[PDB]
Design a protein around this motif. Structure first.
Motif, PDB file in Angstrom:
ATOM      1  N   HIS A  20       0.826  -1.205   0.000  1.00  0.00           N
ATOM      2  CA  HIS A  20       0.000   0.000   0.000  1.00  0.00           C
ATOM      3  C   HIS A  20       0.869   1.268   0.000  1.00  0.00           C
ATOM      4  CE1 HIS A  20      -3.543   2.443   0.641  1.00  0.00           C
ATOM      5  NE2 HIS A  20      -2.762   3.193   1.426  1.00  0.00           N
ATOM      6  N   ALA A  77      -5.266   6.598   6.760  1.00  0.00           N
ATOM      7  CA  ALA A  77      -5.805   5.419   6.073  1.00  0.00           C
ATOM      8  C   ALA A  77      -6.417   4.390   7.029  1.00  0.00           C
ATOM      9  CB  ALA A  77      -4.677   4.762   5.240  1.00  0.00           C
ATOM     10  N   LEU A 133      -6.556  -2.838   4.168  1.00  0.00           N
ATOM     11  CA  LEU A 133      -6.081  -1.912   3.145  1.00  0.00           C
ATOM     12  C   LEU A 133      -5.977  -2.667   1.820  1.00  0.00           C
ATOM     13  CD1 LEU A 133      -3.247   0.325   4.724  1.00  0.00           C
ATOM     14  CD2 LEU A 133      -5.569   0.898   4.175  1.00  0.00           C
ATOM     15  N   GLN A 167      -9.226  -3.130   0.086  1.00  0.00           N
ATOM     16  CA  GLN A 167      -9.676  -1.889  -0.527  1.00  0.00           C
ATOM     17  C   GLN A 167      -8.942  -1.588  -1.802  1.00  0.00           C
ATOM     18  OE1 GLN A 167     -10.790   0.268   3.615  1.00  0.00           O
ATOM     19  NE2 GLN A 167      -9.006   1.030   2.518  1.00  0.00           N
TER      20      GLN A 167
HETATM   21 CL   LIG Z   1      -6.580   4.562   1.817  1.00  0.00          CL
END
Ligand SMILES: [Cl-]
Ligand SMILES: [Cl-]
Length: 162
Positions: free
Chosen positions: A31, A49, A66, A69
């Motif tokens: 990420h 986040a 994360l 997503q």
């Molecule tokens: Cl994010």
């Protein structure tokens, strides 16, 4: 094998802020946090986040969240992209995963820029696309990963990941 397992192999999992292959601050499963040189800025983005004061450290569950997503966002990005969508729709399930992996790594804009390879993929000219995909900075900077994704497009199987 599926997109999640594939990306998990390519990106790894780190529970602390780390620097990616390009030297950018990242966390979890690939990420990207920020392109800025500031660790503080990175910590700030991580907290925003996750929704808590992380101190640059997250849990496995947080990393996976994360990740889910980000995969979702990549797919949604491809479907909204006029240049990517047609390609994606033309491909089989395995090859679709290969395209998602590229988008996850380099973003929609980046992938959309592979005009010629995209056209070759849409035409189902596998070997030719594989050769064209390799003529890129992407392949020269991260050759082992690029090879895995390229083989995936070439064969339509998960052999490179087994
Ligand atoms: Cl994010
Ligand atoms: Cl690599």
């Amino acid at each position: 094998m599926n997109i999640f397992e594939m990306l998990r192999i390519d990106e790894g999992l780190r529970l602390k802020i780390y620097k990616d292959t390009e030297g950018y601050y990242t966390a979890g499963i690939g990420h990207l946090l920020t392109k800025s040189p500031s660790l503080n800025a990175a910590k700030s983005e991580l907290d925003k986040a996750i929704g808590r004061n992380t101190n640059g450290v997250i849990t496995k569950d947080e990393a996976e969240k994360l990740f889910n997503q980000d995969v979702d966002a990549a797919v949604r990005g491809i479907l909204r992209n006029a240049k990517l969508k047609p390609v994606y729709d033309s491909l089989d399930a395995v090859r679709r995963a290969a395209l998602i992996n590229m988008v996850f790594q380099m973003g929609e804009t980046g992938v959309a820029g592979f005009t010629n390879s995209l056209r070759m993929l849409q035409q189902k000219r596998w070997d030719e696309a594989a050769v064209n995909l390799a003529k890129s900075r992407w392949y020269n900077q991260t050759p082992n990963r690029a090879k895995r994704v390229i083989t995936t497009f070439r064969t339509g199987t998960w052999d490179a990941y087994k």
